[PDB]
Amino acid sequence: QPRKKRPEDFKFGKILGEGSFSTVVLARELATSREYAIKILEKRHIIKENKVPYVTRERDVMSRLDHPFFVKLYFTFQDDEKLYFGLSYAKNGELLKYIRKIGSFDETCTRFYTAEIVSALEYLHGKGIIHRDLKPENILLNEDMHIQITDFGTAKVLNSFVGTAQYVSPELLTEKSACKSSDLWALGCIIYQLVAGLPPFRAGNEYLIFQKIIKLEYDFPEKFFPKARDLVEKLLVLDATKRLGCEEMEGYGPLKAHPFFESVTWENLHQQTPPKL
Ligand SMILES: CN[C@@H]1C[C@H]2O[C@@](C)([C@@H]1OC)n1c3ccccc3c3c4c(c5c6ccccc6n2c5c31)C(=O)N[C@@H]4O
User: Fold this and answer.
1) Long-range contact list for 257-263, CB < 8 A, 24+ apart?
2) Do 238 and 120 reside in the same domain of the chain?
3) Active site residues per annotation
4) Looking at the structure, do residues 107 and 35 belong to the same domain, yes or no?
5) Measured in angstroms, how far is the CA atom of residue 233 from the centroid of ligand 1?
6) Which residue, 1, 62, 211, 271, is the most exposed by fewest CB within 10 angstroms?
7) Where are the alpha helices (DSSP H) in the chain?
8) Where, per the database record, does this protein carry Phosphoserine?
9) Beta bridge partners of 141
10) Is residue 209 in contact with ligand 1, taking CB distance under 6 Å?
């Protein structure tokens, strides 16, 4: 394998984002000119906050990801005080950004982008890994406009966690548990948000949001594409074992077979050219 890389091999640039225990900075490797998104974490802050298991799990899960719709971990290293993860750089940023720019997606884009996510989850769940905090802010877009799902610091590899309020599944609020269906629930929310322009469960604070979630309290606007609406209702189901896509419902075949995906060719999605937004 190559020599361990170090800080001096890069020319760090702008900050792409900040997390609670980390900072992601765009860096260009001097010897190759390649751009990487480097996640930086302070060893002391992690130990003081008892996050070692979390950072470790994050690195282990990312090291197993080998698919075009997911972030790729190219390398890691550390100096006396910090940990460095070398990640693939998704130049176009958050999907949420596009959602806001154009308000909402027409049908061709909703279908294309939902298909990529479904295809990514099928690959993720096939390795027995669950994200647990899937959302438009975590789904990035590469230079070609294909998705790049990242942020695995909250993943579970087949109850100690609750992601973003608006995307939390009901089982998480009434059992502290979570599984593949939790991601499918988040998927439903995301599909609803692509078509409507906003997530299904909204309210003044988290308590009120959690309240609507457990009572399955949301509704579709008049325009909502019929087939997408049907898919969403089969995803936003209170009983986790009744969601289209889960093992009890027989997996991904039935989900990918949904009428909404009728015209979709699942086989080579990352080869296809994305519809313009
Ligand atoms: C809430 N959105 C943030 C957007 C911004 O910073 C964050 C922290 C968040 O992306 C999920 N962020 C991460 C968090 C955890 C792991 C990896 C990343 C990451 C990558 C990237 C980016 C990024 C690229 C372009 C604009 C904003 C970006 N942000 C990130 C990243 C990236 O390109 N590769 C890493 O996966």
Assistant:
1) 258/227, 258/230, 258/231, 258/234, 259/227, 259/230, 260/111, 260/114, 260/225, 260/227, 260/228, 260/230, 260/231, 261/111, 261/114, 261/115, 261/118, 262/227, 263/111
2) yes
3) 133
4) no
5) 30
6) 1
7) 43-48, 52-62, 95-101, 107-126, 170-175, 180-196, 206-214, 226-233, 252-256
8) 160
9) 147
10) no
Looking at 52, 69, 93, the residue that finishes a domain is 93
Q: Which domain holds residue 11?
A: 1-93
Distance CA 46, CA 39 (A): 14
- Asked how this structure was determined, the answer is X-ray
CATH number at residue 74: 3.30.200.20
Helix (H, G, I), strand (E, B) or coil at 250: coil
From the list 140, 186, 139, the residue with the least C-alpha distance to 162 is 186
Which one, of 42, 52, 34, lies nearest residue 18 by Cα? 42
- CA-nearest residue for atom 34, ligand 1, is 89
Buried b (16+ CB within 10 A) or exposed e, 170-192: bbbeeeeebbbbbbbbbbbbbbb
The conformational region for residue 151 under phi > 0 = left, psi -120 to 50 = alpha, else beta, is: left
This PDB structure is determined at a resolution in Å of 2.5
Tell whether residue 20 is among the known ligand binding residues: yes
CA of 142 to the centre of ligand 1 (A): 11
Indicate the residue type of 251.
G
